[PDB]
Every structure is written in C-alpha cells, then in structure tokens.
Design a protein around this nucleic acid. Structure first.
Length: 63
DNA sequence: TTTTTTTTTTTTGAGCGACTGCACTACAACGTTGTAGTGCAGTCGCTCTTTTTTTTGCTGGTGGTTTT
C-alpha cells in the first residue's frame, strides 16, 4: 500500500520512520533497506540521524 | 657516465610652425647708396582624449570521493 506522510519538518518524518522500523521488523535479517534520498549529503544526514536514534545504522542502502 | 663556474647597464620624439639673423636683388632718393621684400638657415615651443557590450546545462536523470 502506497503511504504518503505529510509533515512540515523532517524530524517528525524520521520519528515516523523509527516507529515503522520498530513496529514492523524485517523477516530476513540481511535484507537491505532502501531509503530514497535527494543527494549523498541528505543520505549522510539521514544515516547520522538513524545512528543517533537506533544506536546503529548498518545494512541500509540509500539509492 | 662523470661534472665547472658567473653578478655589470645601456636606450628611447619628431613633424608643424614660428623667431631671428644674414644674404640678395629692385627700385627710388641723392653713378652711387639706403630701404624694402624675399630666400635660406640655425634655433626653439608644442603636443599628442574620452569606453563597454556574455550563453555555458547546481543533482540532464544506470547519477553518488576517500577505506581497507
């Protein structure tokens, strides 16, 4: 199902992504997680925020 | 295939046009001489702007910097 989350800032969207990750876990542990980004810098900032939120940011692809 | 020395600067404006001095003949005043007009040459001032006009792909799209 296609889901669009309207928000004013990206911190609430990162909290929603954290809630989706902690709610629904992947069946395969080595299955990659695709996070579509605008650029490499936004991918690095999202990896920084996911490392600060989860404690670990690994096996996450930013295509 | 190897390798040596070394510390002195220079030069540069020219054509256009006038000022002044000396020679040179034409002609009228008193055969000869003084004044006037022009030619030629040495010397010298002067003077040489202003300015601005543009398209280029931010990531146009299997793209993306950096660690063992």
């Amino acid at each position: 199902m296609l889901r669009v989350y309207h928000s004013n800032r990206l911190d609430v969207l990162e909290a929603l992504m954290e809630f989706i990750v902690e709610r629904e876990r992947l069946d395969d542990p080595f299955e990659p997680e695709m996070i579509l980004v605008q650029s490499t810098g936004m991918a690095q900032w999202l990896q920084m925020t996911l490392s600060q939120k989860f404690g670990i940011a690994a096996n996450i692809d930013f295509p």
